[PDB]
Design a protein around this motif. Sequence first.
Motif, mmCIF file in Angstrom:
data_model
loop_
_atom_site.group_PDB
_atom_site.id
_atom_site.type_symbol
_atom_site.label_atom_id
_atom_site.label_comp_id
_atom_site.label_asym_id
_atom_site.label_seq_id
_atom_site.Cartn_x
_atom_site.Cartn_y
_atom_site.Cartn_z
ATOM 1 N N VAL A 46 -0.910 1.182 -0.191
ATOM 2 C CA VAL A 46 -2.357 1.022 -0.061
ATOM 3 C C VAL A 46 -2.803 1.461 1.349
ATOM 4 C CG1 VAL A 46 -3.965 -0.980 0.288
ATOM 5 C CG2 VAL A 46 -2.737 -0.646 -1.927
ATOM 6 N N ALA A 47 -2.064 1.124 2.401
ATOM 7 C CA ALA A 47 -2.476 1.517 3.788
ATOM 8 C C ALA A 47 -2.393 3.044 4.008
ATOM 9 C CB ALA A 47 -1.667 0.845 4.883
ATOM 10 N N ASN B 103 -5.616 4.210 2.218
ATOM 11 C CA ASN B 103 -6.850 3.870 2.919
ATOM 12 C C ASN B 103 -6.940 4.398 4.353
ATOM 13 O OD1 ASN B 103 -8.111 2.477 0.777
ATOM 14 N ND2 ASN B 103 -6.945 0.589 1.263
ATOM 15 N N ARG B 104 -5.819 4.667 5.025
ATOM 16 C CA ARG B 104 -5.867 4.990 6.436
ATOM 17 C C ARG B 104 -5.209 6.328 6.862
ATOM 18 N NH1 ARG B 104 -4.620 -0.593 9.362
ATOM 19 N NH2 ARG B 104 -5.718 0.401 11.091
HETATM 20 CL CL LIG Z 1 -5.530 -0.757 3.864
#
Ligand SMILES: [Cl-]
Length: 129
Positions: free
Chosen positions: A109-110, A113-114
């Motif tokens: 997920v990171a 998202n990043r």
């Molecule tokens: Cl995140």
Amino acid sequence: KVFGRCELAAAMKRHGLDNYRGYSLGNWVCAAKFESNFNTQATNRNTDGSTDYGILQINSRWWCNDGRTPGSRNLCNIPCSALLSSDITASVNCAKKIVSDGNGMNAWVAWRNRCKGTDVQAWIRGCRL
Ligand SMILES: [Cl-]
Ligand SMILES: [Cl-]
Ligand SMILES: [Cl-]
Ligand SMILES: [Cl-]
Ligand SMILES: [Cl-]
Ligand SMILES: [Cl-]
Ligand code: NA
Ligand SMILES: [Ru+3]
């Protein structure tokens, strides 16, 4: 072990992550930064009761066994504690299986998202690789 940025890049390269499943080395470094801050000992409990372990925050519901995640699998066949070692072999081998399993690096997920879509080559800037 808290790796340095180029140090971790080097280690990941040697272990065959640069361009593994088409993900350039910077993607893997960027994921590591935001998952663990380059700390092999990082652990974080998830809402579902599973835990994420090590430099790439590999999740005990599916990938490693920690003895406390009911109804979980251990698809990397490894105790989750092996993912905390100073030696990143187990974490990389298991990440290879994760990234191969359908959704590529979106499993992190990171990363999605990043890191996804960003200038991830910045993460290996200045490193002798
Ligand atoms: Cl995140
Ligand atoms: Cl890169
Ligand atoms: Cl924890
Ligand atoms: Cl378990
Ligand atoms: Cl085990
Ligand atoms: Cl290593
Ligand atoms: Na498990
Ligand atoms: Ru090694």
